[PDB]
Design a protein around this nucleic acid. Structure first.
Ligand SMILES: NC[C@@H]1O[C@H](O[C@H]2[C@@H](O)[C@H](O[C@@H]3[C@@H](O)[C@H](N)C[C@H](N)[C@H]3O[C@H]3O[C@H](CO)[C@@H](O)[C@H](O)[C@H]3N)O[C@@H]2CO)[C@H](N)[C@@H](O)[C@@H]1O
Ligand SMILES: [Mg+2]
Ligand SMILES: [Mg+2]
Ligand SMILES: [Mg+2]
Ligand SMILES: [Mg+2]
Ligand SMILES: [Mg+2]
Ligand SMILES: [Mg+2]
Ligand SMILES: [Mg+2]
Ligand SMILES: [Mg+2]
Ligand SMILES: [Mg+2]
Ligand SMILES: [Mg+2]
Ligand SMILES: [Mg+2]
Ligand SMILES: [Mg+2]
Ligand SMILES: [Mg+2]
Ligand SMILES: [Mg+2]
Ligand SMILES: [Mg+2]
Ligand SMILES: [Mg+2]
Ligand SMILES: [Mg+2]
Ligand SMILES: [Mg+2]
Ligand SMILES: [Mg+2]
Ligand SMILES: [Mg+2]
Ligand SMILES: [Mg+2]
Ligand SMILES: [Mg+2]
Ligand SMILES: [Mg+2]
Ligand SMILES: [Mg+2]
Ligand SMILES: [Mg+2]
Ligand SMILES: [Mg+2]
Ligand SMILES: [Mg+2]
Ligand SMILES: [Mg+2]
Ligand SMILES: [Mg+2]
Ligand SMILES: [Mg+2]
Ligand SMILES: [Mg+2]
Ligand SMILES: [Mg+2]
Ligand SMILES: [Mg+2]
Ligand SMILES: [Mg+2]
Ligand SMILES: [Mg+2]
Ligand SMILES: [Mg+2]
Ligand SMILES: [Mg+2]
Ligand SMILES: [Mg+2]
Ligand SMILES: [Mg+2]
Ligand SMILES: [Mg+2]
Ligand SMILES: [Mg+2]
Ligand SMILES: [Mg+2]
Ligand SMILES: [Mg+2]
Ligand SMILES: [Mg+2]
Ligand SMILES: [Mg+2]
Ligand SMILES: [Mg+2]
Ligand SMILES: [Mg+2]
Ligand SMILES: [Mg+2]
Ligand SMILES: [Mg+2]
Ligand SMILES: [Mg+2]
Ligand SMILES: [Mg+2]
Ligand SMILES: [Mg+2]
Ligand SMILES: [Mg+2]
Ligand SMILES: [Mg+2]
Ligand SMILES: [Mg+2]
Ligand SMILES: [Mg+2]
Ligand SMILES: [Mg+2]
Ligand SMILES: [Mg+2]
Ligand SMILES: [Mg+2]
Ligand SMILES: [Mg+2]
Ligand SMILES: [Mg+2]
Ligand SMILES: [Mg+2]
Ligand SMILES: [Mg+2]
Ligand SMILES: [Mg+2]
Ligand SMILES: [Mg+2]
Ligand SMILES: [Mg+2]
Ligand SMILES: [Mg+2]
Ligand SMILES: [Mg+2]
Ligand SMILES: [Mg+2]
Ligand SMILES: [Mg+2]
Ligand SMILES: [Mg+2]
Ligand SMILES: [Mg+2]
Ligand SMILES: [Mg+2]
Ligand SMILES: [Mg+2]
Ligand SMILES: [Mg+2]
Ligand SMILES: [Mg+2]
Ligand SMILES: [Mg+2]
Ligand SMILES: [Mg+2]
Ligand SMILES: [Mg+2]
Ligand SMILES: [Mg+2]
Ligand SMILES: [Mg+2]
Ligand SMILES: [Mg+2]
Ligand SMILES: [Mg+2]
Ligand SMILES: [Mg+2]
Ligand SMILES: [Mg+2]
Ligand SMILES: [Mg+2]
Ligand SMILES: [Mg+2]
Ligand SMILES: [Mg+2]
Ligand SMILES: [Mg+2]
Ligand SMILES: [Mg+2]
Ligand SMILES: [Mg+2]
Ligand SMILES: [Mg+2]
Ligand SMILES: [Mg+2]
Ligand SMILES: [Mg+2]
Ligand SMILES: [Mg+2]
Ligand SMILES: [Mg+2]
Ligand SMILES: [Mg+2]
Ligand SMILES: [Mg+2]
Ligand SMILES: [Mg+2]
Ligand SMILES: [Mg+2]
Ligand SMILES: [Mg+2]
Ligand SMILES: [Mg+2]
Ligand SMILES: [Mg+2]
Ligand SMILES: [Mg+2]
Ligand SMILES: [Mg+2]
Ligand SMILES: [Mg+2]
Ligand SMILES: [Mg+2]
Ligand SMILES: [Mg+2]
Ligand SMILES: [Mg+2]
Ligand SMILES: [Mg+2]
Ligand SMILES: [Mg+2]
Ligand SMILES: [Mg+2]
Ligand SMILES: [Mg+2]
Ligand SMILES: [Mg+2]
Ligand SMILES: [Mg+2]
Ligand SMILES: [Mg+2]
Ligand SMILES: [Mg+2]
Ligand SMILES: [Mg+2]
Ligand SMILES: [Mg+2]
Ligand SMILES: [Mg+2]
Ligand SMILES: [Mg+2]
Ligand SMILES: [Mg+2]
Ligand SMILES: [Mg+2]
Ligand SMILES: [Mg+2]
Ligand SMILES: [Mg+2]
Ligand SMILES: [Mg+2]
Ligand SMILES: [Mg+2]
Ligand SMILES: [Mg+2]
Ligand SMILES: [Mg+2]
Ligand SMILES: [Mg+2]
Ligand SMILES: [Mg+2]
Ligand SMILES: [Mg+2]
Ligand SMILES: [Mg+2]
Ligand SMILES: [Mg+2]
Ligand SMILES: [Mg+2]
Ligand SMILES: [Mg+2]
Ligand SMILES: [Mg+2]
Ligand SMILES: [Mg+2]
Ligand SMILES: [Mg+2]
Ligand SMILES: [Mg+2]
Ligand SMILES: [Mg+2]
Ligand SMILES: [Mg+2]
Ligand SMILES: [Mg+2]
Ligand SMILES: [Mg+2]
Ligand SMILES: [Mg+2]
Ligand SMILES: [Mg+2]
Ligand SMILES: [Mg+2]
Ligand SMILES: [Mg+2]
Ligand SMILES: [Mg+2]
Lengths: 47, 273
RNA sequence: GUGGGAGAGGGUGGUGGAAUUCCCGGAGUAGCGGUGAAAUGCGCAGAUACCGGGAGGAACGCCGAUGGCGAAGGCAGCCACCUGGUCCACCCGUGACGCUGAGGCGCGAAAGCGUGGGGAGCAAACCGGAUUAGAUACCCGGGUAGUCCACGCCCUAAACG
RNA sequence: CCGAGGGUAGGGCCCGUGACUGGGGCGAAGUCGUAACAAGGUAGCUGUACCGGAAGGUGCGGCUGGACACC
RNA sequence: CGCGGGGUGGAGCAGCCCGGUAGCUCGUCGGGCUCAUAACCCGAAGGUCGUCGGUUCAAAUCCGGCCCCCGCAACCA
RNA sequence: GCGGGGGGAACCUGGGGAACUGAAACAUCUCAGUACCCAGAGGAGAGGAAAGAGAAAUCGACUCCCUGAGUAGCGGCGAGC
RNA sequence: CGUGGUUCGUGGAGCCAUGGGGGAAUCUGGGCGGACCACCGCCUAAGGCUAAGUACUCCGGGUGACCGAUAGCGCACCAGU
RNA sequence: GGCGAGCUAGCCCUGGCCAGGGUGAAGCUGGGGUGAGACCCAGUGGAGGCCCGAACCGGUGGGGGAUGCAAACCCCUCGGA
RNA sequence: UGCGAAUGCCGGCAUGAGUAACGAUAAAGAGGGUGAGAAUCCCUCUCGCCGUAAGCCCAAGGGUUCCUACGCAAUGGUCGUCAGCGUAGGGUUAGGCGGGACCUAAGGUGAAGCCGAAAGGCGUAGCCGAAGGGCAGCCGGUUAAUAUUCCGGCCCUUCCCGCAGGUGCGAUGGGGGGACGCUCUAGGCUAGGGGGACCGGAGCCAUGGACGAGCCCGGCCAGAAGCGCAGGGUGGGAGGUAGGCAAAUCCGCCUCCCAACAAGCUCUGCGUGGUGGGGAAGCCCGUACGGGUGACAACCCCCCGAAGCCAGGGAGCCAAGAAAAGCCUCUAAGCACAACCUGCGGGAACCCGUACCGCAAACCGACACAGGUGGGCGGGUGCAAGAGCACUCAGGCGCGCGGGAGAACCCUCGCCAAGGAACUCUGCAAGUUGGCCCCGUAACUUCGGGAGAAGGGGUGCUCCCUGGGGUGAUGAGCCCCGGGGAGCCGCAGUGAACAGGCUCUGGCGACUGUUUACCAAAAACACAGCUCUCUGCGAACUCGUAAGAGGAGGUAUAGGGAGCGACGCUUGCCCGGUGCCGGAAGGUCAAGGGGAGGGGUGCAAGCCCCGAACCGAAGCCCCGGUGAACGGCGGCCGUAACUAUAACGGUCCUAAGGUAGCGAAAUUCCUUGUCGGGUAAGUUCCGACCUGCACGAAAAGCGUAACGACCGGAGCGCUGUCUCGGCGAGGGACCCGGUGAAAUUGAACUGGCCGUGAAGAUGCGGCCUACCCGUGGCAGGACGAAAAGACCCCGUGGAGCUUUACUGC
RNA sequence: CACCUCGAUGUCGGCUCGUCGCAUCCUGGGGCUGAAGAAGGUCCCAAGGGUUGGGCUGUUCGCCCAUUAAAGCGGCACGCG
């Protein structure tokens, strides 16, 4: 049956993208955290 | 008046469509005069602030002229009578002699050949527009300014009209379609006559769908909800209102008067009961 | 046919005043209403009675008759438009072209009915006061439908001379 | 082939009959009230409409087969 | 079994609750009015207060039991 | 023309600011001006030279440590602070 | 007047702060010493800056009656994988 | 305090899809009817949250599955279309 | 700092067990090859399975999986020599396809502005944003692998510079256009398909017959200008001009003049077109693959015919159907040497994508998972049609464990004597029926319906005659729709597959719709419709601290809230309480005004503190209204000339005491009420009565045609539901080879009875029975597994919900 | 009553399959009889076997139809998911 992951490469980048995160203080602090934790990738892949 | 239908289907039995014989145009409208428009009943923040709206037919917004007083004295020919789907009423296309084209809401009794003017000058005749101070007492009237130069807010709905009961100082006394009795400034324009397509009120939607076409989504009663949802909901096996009947938001929906008390507007209102 | 005539004859659009009710303002005080007599009701939160203003609906006083019109039901302030029947004088025209009329069709007071309006006064139902053994009545205070308009139905009658 | 008729299926009309139900006729002296006949004590009748144990009452319009004093 | 109210002239209700006193309407009786009956007027009669114990000076009235009456409740199962 | 912008583990000041919990229930009260969120600051930050203390004719800017002291008080005079 | 801060929870409630209303004076002026008044004292509001002593540990170093690969950081190993 | 409407619900903007058959509304034309009508019939016409039924959307009943092919499936049947 | 327990934590290893399974029942068999090794790789043949797909193409998404060489440890549910796996090399080519140096849509962002403790919220213009608008490439060949990309052929677009000819040029400004719905649909085309006795072609005569006007294969594709057919769009001239926020000659508007037509002008489609290019069976080798000839290939007639094209076509309807740029046109500055227009010519023409999978073993589902996933094309025959159904093209596949046996049992399926619902909560299930044509068709009805009512007849093949249609000629041929006659065979002609069982009668809901993703599809929601109510417009109301917004670019025939729920006939009485609505008086009423009087302290002038009367809102009280507002609509006793019963009376209470209708009900306890119907027999059902525990009128009352995967009752038809089972098929189950789990598990050397024991003993007592160990089976027991019982209580545990609980906001 | 079981002892009825008790429904054997015969009554022995089909209701039960030699009552976690 239909399931919850329906990949659409645009949606990934406009939702979880780097410019998303920067646009908003919630999201800048996600980057702050991801970075300070030493995350290799601050933000999701999409091609 | 009001086409009916044989019952070749359930709901074709009660359906009732307008007599469009008045309409001289069909698929127009004057392309120079109309933008578009959209909504959802949702508001700038994304939220439903009016319940049960959506879907229904695409529309182009006929731009229509509620200021007659900026053409004072130029005459106009009624060019067509056509179908506005943003209003109960009908809109007449009129060519001015400027060559300027404009929409007006179309009075009852307005044939399309005729001449129409607006201003203190102004014969008193169906279609003309004047300061209320120059319209003879007892005239029925529609498309009335509430305040001078601000546009017509009063009696624009298909079939509506209003009436001059007398004059006081700078103000004349009107009986609105509501029956309210009201003073409006002398300087407010109004056009003479009644709105027409008065047969409007007798259409019979006939099926759920005819409501959907108009953007009217199903309306679910408090009674049919749970108590999270609404002052009446629960018990079930039906239930009487169990309390003074209420809105979703808790206020009382029988008898309770919501007009604000100190509105400086009350100096100009005498009625409505 | 011509020339005339009387008329609330019918349909339409207008419109006038008297009155009732309601509201506003004045002035003004203790009752007003109602009946057989009373009570309910209304009234110092200022009624009734008086004056001024406005709103609105409905019916048309004197004329008015023991009268006129219409086939009947029916028709009554005034103005206009449109329109029917009818009478008299002339003796002009056609030349029996007539009378009736099962069925058909149409009209049909009041009440009632549908859909919109309108709603002053009145008033089924209903409520109250009184009366009475009782009083689901007659009288009194209220009062909705209705009474009015448009459209469409109903098709009855002591529709009687 | 037609064909008495048998069979299956669905109509129409007519008689009979049926818990129960509706009124109606009729049957000396049961119960309630008084509508009508005299202005019958609210003149009556009436089409219709609502109401009411019952007769009836009320509304609207109509019929007369109803009307020597008082303002 | 349970909880609340009740049991008063012939009928329907007051009075109990706050101790001492039994009242209202209808009925029934006697008399009028009427030819007569009702309507109506004037008059009277009528109850031990379910019952059994107690309290008190005194109990329809306060308490207990019994006998009935009306009502409410009996749920998770 | 000079400057600002953004980042920094924790630490600092400011603007805002909880609930569980405790009170053996719970509202005042507590947790707590904590957690958190926001702005700014720096290598520190804040504070700082008396319209101060507060009983002495005394002390002499501010910060931090010990002490005063679980004292003075505060407190559904409760838990507690 | 309405609140916050203080130990102060409306208390006899001052002090400091201030959202609202009213609204002065310049030494013979003003604040304060716990309502208020008198006396006696203290102090000079409504401009600003100010090292050091203090906080902290991303970082570097020294030292452990600190661990020794189920411990010690989550990660002794190309782990915030 | 933040992260989520790539599932799902609603709306918004812009596209797309709906074999085939059936039944036969108004209207229009003609004819009849009438004083003129209403109206009647025929042809035409092609309306409809109209009918049968694929695609598509469903999920009615029953069987199966039940450490499944599957954390909702399969088969027969069935609703809309 | 000592472990045995915490359904503890981490790891390791056991049991179950060589057990269940090995993932669609579309199906395999042999021969040859390869190799250490082969059911499983390669090739051949035969068989079988998809074919509106299980074929082909595109978009997502995925991200080297593509091609080839070498490999088989692992991955692959077995095997593997094989692979989507390991290693390694190679492979994606564009001015025209897609997207960007274009346009705008929702939305987003956002100079200006506005608002907000901070962070931030909003917002005009603008900007961003696409599967929409605009926009120039068609056919073939080529590689192991890419191709509208490379190559061949034939076309085209922009920009730059030049030349010529033309012209008031000139834009971000004005105007036109772009530019639009849904049904139905004309005429002409093409895609595609069928047939030909005609054209071209290797070859074949088998097994009885056939040397044939035989049989089998094929008989096209792309193509500028010009042209032809079919269509789209489309007036011309002047005069006036005040409108289109300047300007206009443009557009608008008025007047006059000629066109009425595509006449012309113009655009597109098709066709034809120089030219370019393909081109079968078969046979031969020779292939993962395809390669020669056949060939110098032929290359044409007929017919069927789109849903596609001409395209802004036409008609009708109402619910009334984007924008902006390209494009044209108008003028402003400004420049008129410039600029623009047209044609020609040369030059210039960037970035990204391009492999491969793509209904799936490569995407979403932890899996090579029976699930899910948008657009396109999807051939042939026959059955009325069709994308349906059976077979079949091209093309693709036999589903990555196999071999045997032929028990129980299970699943899926076939058939059955007599009976025919006796089954059972219920005909659940299965069966019947079944398409098309024709006859025929009731109650009732809102006059449409009900209807496919019901019930029947027809249904193949042959020969004969015969009517109209399309296309062609008015002809034949080819197709289409018929009509009549006479015969043939079988058990049977919708001969297989796809395709209603029907009738009667109740309850509920008007109807189509909607719903609990994943135990409820319904009598629930919604629904047209009716009523109340609010709301005069900066509306009421909703979201937001606000700004702002929705409402609505709406205006009382509108908009919000509430209830009721098509339609019919109707919806009674009570306003005491509560709510709402109205009331300028009165009462009480907080801050504030007031300051009679009192107080503290000063020598005092004073400073400070109380503070009565009185004035002082809303609210409350009070007065009234109000029912499609919350709601509520009685008790006891008596009475008729049998009896019963009580039209009638008495009395007590209420704000008023339930009208009509309906009633043992989706409501009736007693209850299986009583009576009637149906049945041989009826706690259900249907019709009645009325003693309504405990109906009743918009939480509507009573009805109602039509409708329903709703729930009840009855009949006919028909049946393996049943009497009552039998047989048969296949996939399991069994046996063999390969692979090999699971929950559970204190340890076990794990019998029966009668007792006993914490009360239900394999484990204790007595007695009985009993050689050791397994296989296939059944489920009585291990108080069997699973899930720290959901019911029940407990806890001063939690959460959702309500209110005239408290206290706040 | 509250003793095992609330870290689970699935609850009515049906069906299937039984097995046991006897306080015997039938058949066998008997005593008494107010037993003429036949046919009953009541009691004693006896558990070997037997003990129907159907309408209604979820029903157990029960009512009813048609038969019967008879249409037995109980236990087995109201035997047996
Ligand atoms: N035709 C009958 C009609 O209906 C009614 O008639 C019936 C009754 O009204 C009337 O009943 C009457 C009654 O009014 C009168 N006041 C009392 C009287 N005893 C009764 O009488 C009846 O009862 C007795 C039985 O006891 C019978 O024997 C007698 O025949 C009969 N009259 O008797 C009639 C039946 O017999 C009306 N009276 C009237 O409309 C008309 O007469
Ligand atoms: Mg789907
Ligand atoms: Mg790195
Ligand atoms: Mg937003
Ligand atoms: Mg739609
Ligand atoms: Mg609703
Ligand atoms: Mg609900
Ligand atoms: Mg919610
Ligand atoms: Mg609520
Ligand atoms: Mg409720
Ligand atoms: Mg209920
Ligand atoms: Mg006249
Ligand atoms: Mg006349
Ligand atoms: Mg003559
Ligand atoms: Mg009439
Ligand atoms: Mg009338
Ligand atoms: Mg009156
Ligand atoms: Mg008369
Ligand atoms: Mg015959
Ligand atoms: Mg016959
Ligand atoms: Mg009388
Ligand atoms: Mg009378
Ligand atoms: Mg009389
Ligand atoms: Mg009356
Ligand atoms: Mg006494
Ligand atoms: Mg910084
Ligand atoms: Mg702070
Ligand atoms: Mg606590
Ligand atoms: Mg608690
Ligand atoms: Mg410093
Ligand atoms: Mg500093
Ligand atoms: Mg400083
Ligand atoms: Mg503290
Ligand atoms: Mg404080
Ligand atoms: Mg203080
Ligand atoms: Mg001073
Ligand atoms: Mg101070
Ligand atoms: Mg001090
Ligand atoms: Mg002091
Ligand atoms: Mg000091
Ligand atoms: Mg050590
Ligand atoms: Mg060591
Ligand atoms: Mg470690
Ligand atoms: Mg080690
Ligand atoms: Mg670790
Ligand atoms: Mg979504
Ligand atoms: Mg969505
Ligand atoms: Mg398709
Ligand atoms: Mg179709
Ligand atoms: Mg059709
Ligand atoms: Mg159709
Ligand atoms: Mg349909
Ligand atoms: Mg299903
Ligand atoms: Mg379901
Ligand atoms: Mg269908
Ligand atoms: Mg120790
Ligand atoms: Mg231990
Ligand atoms: Mg085993
Ligand atoms: Mg096995
Ligand atoms: Mg397999
Ligand atoms: Mg298999
Ligand atoms: Mg096949
Ligand atoms: Mg096919
Ligand atoms: Mg991709
Ligand atoms: Mg490969
Ligand atoms: Mg392997
Ligand atoms: Mg590889
Ligand atoms: Mg761009
Ligand atoms: Mg460039
Ligand atoms: Mg743009
Ligand atoms: Mg924004
Ligand atoms: Mg695009
Ligand atoms: Mg595009
Ligand atoms: Mg392009
Ligand atoms: Mg090609
Ligand atoms: Mg490519
Ligand atoms: Mg120009
Ligand atoms: Mg433009
Ligand atoms: Mg041969
Ligand atoms: Mg062959
Ligand atoms: Mg061919
Ligand atoms: Mg060509
Ligand atoms: Mg050759
Ligand atoms: Mg068109
Ligand atoms: Mg699929
Ligand atoms: Mg596909
Ligand atoms: Mg694949
Ligand atoms: Mg597989
Ligand atoms: Mg799959
Ligand atoms: Mg699909
Ligand atoms: Mg077919
Ligand atoms: Mg198929
Ligand atoms: Mg059989
Ligand atoms: Mg049979
Ligand atoms: Mg069935
Ligand atoms: Mg069939
Ligand atoms: Mg049939
Ligand atoms: Mg044959
Ligand atoms: Mg069918
Ligand atoms: Mg029933
Ligand atoms: Mg329904
Ligand atoms: Mg449907
Ligand atoms: Mg629902
Ligand atoms: Mg569900
Ligand atoms: Mg359904
Ligand atoms: Mg607005
Ligand atoms: Mg708007
Ligand atoms: Mg409802
Ligand atoms: Mg209803
Ligand atoms: Mg009512
Ligand atoms: Mg009331
Ligand atoms: Mg009242
Ligand atoms: Mg009230
Ligand atoms: Mg007052
Ligand atoms: Mg007040
Ligand atoms: Mg009152
Ligand atoms: Mg009543
Ligand atoms: Mg009953
Ligand atoms: Mg019954
Ligand atoms: Mg009941
Ligand atoms: Mg019944
Ligand atoms: Mg009810
Ligand atoms: Mg009601
Ligand atoms: Mg009913
Ligand atoms: Mg019905
Ligand atoms: Mg349905
Ligand atoms: Mg259904
Ligand atoms: Mg069987
Ligand atoms: Mg077998
Ligand atoms: Mg042993
Ligand atoms: Mg034992
Ligand atoms: Mg022992
Ligand atoms: Mg075994
Ligand atoms: Mg077992
Ligand atoms: Mg088993
Ligand atoms: Mg537990
Ligand atoms: Mg407690
Ligand atoms: Mg609690
Ligand atoms: Mg116990
Ligand atoms: Mg005990
Ligand atoms: Mg338990
Ligand atoms: Mg256990
Ligand atoms: Mg267990
Ligand atoms: Mg015995
Ligand atoms: Mg014997
Ligand atoms: Mg025995
Ligand atoms: Mg049953
Ligand atoms: Mg029973
Ligand atoms: Mg049991
Ligand atoms: Mg079970």
């Amino acid at each position: 049956m239909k399931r919850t992951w329906q990949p659409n490469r645009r949606k990934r980048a406009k939702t979880h993208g780097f410019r998303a995160r920067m646009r908003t203080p919630g999201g800048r602090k996600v980057l702050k955290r991801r970075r300070q934790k030493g995350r290799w990738r601050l933000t999701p892949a999409v091609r | 008046a009001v086409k009916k239908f044989k019952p070749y289907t359930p709901s074709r039995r009660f359906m009732t469509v307008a007599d469009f014989s008045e309409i001289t145009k069909t698929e127009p409208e004057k392309s120079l005069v109309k933008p578009l428009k959209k909504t959802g009943g949702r508001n700038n923040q994304g939220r439903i602030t009016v319940r049960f709206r959506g879907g229904g037919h695409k529309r182009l917004y006929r731009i229509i002229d509620f200021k007659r007083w900026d053409k004072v004295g130029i005459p106009a020919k009624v060019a067509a009578i056509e179908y506005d789907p943003n209003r109960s009423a009908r809109i007449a296309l009129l060519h001015y002699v400027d060559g300027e084209k404009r929409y007006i809401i179309a009075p009852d009794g307005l044939q399309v050949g005729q001449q129409v003017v607006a201003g203190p000058d102004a014969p008193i005749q169906v279609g003309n527009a004047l300061p209320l101070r120059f319209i003879p007492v007892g005239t029925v009237v529609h498309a009335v300014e509430l305040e001078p130069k601000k546009g017509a807010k009063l009696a624009r709905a298909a079939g509506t009209s209003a009436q001059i009961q007398g004059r006081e100082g700078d103000y004349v006394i009107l009986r609105l379609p509501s029956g309210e009795l009201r003073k409006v400034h002398g300087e407010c324009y109004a056009t003479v006559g009644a709105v027409g397509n008065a047969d409007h009120k007798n259409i019979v939607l006939g099926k759920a769908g005819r409501s959907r076409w108009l953007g009217r989504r199903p309306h679910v009663r408090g009674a049919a909800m749970n108590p999270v949802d609404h002052p009446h909901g629960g018990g079930e096996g039906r239930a009487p209102r169990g309390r003074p009947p209420a809105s979703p938001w808790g206020w009382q929906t029988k008898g309770l008067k919501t007009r604000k008390r100190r509105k400086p507007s009350s100096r100009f209102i005498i009625a409505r009961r």
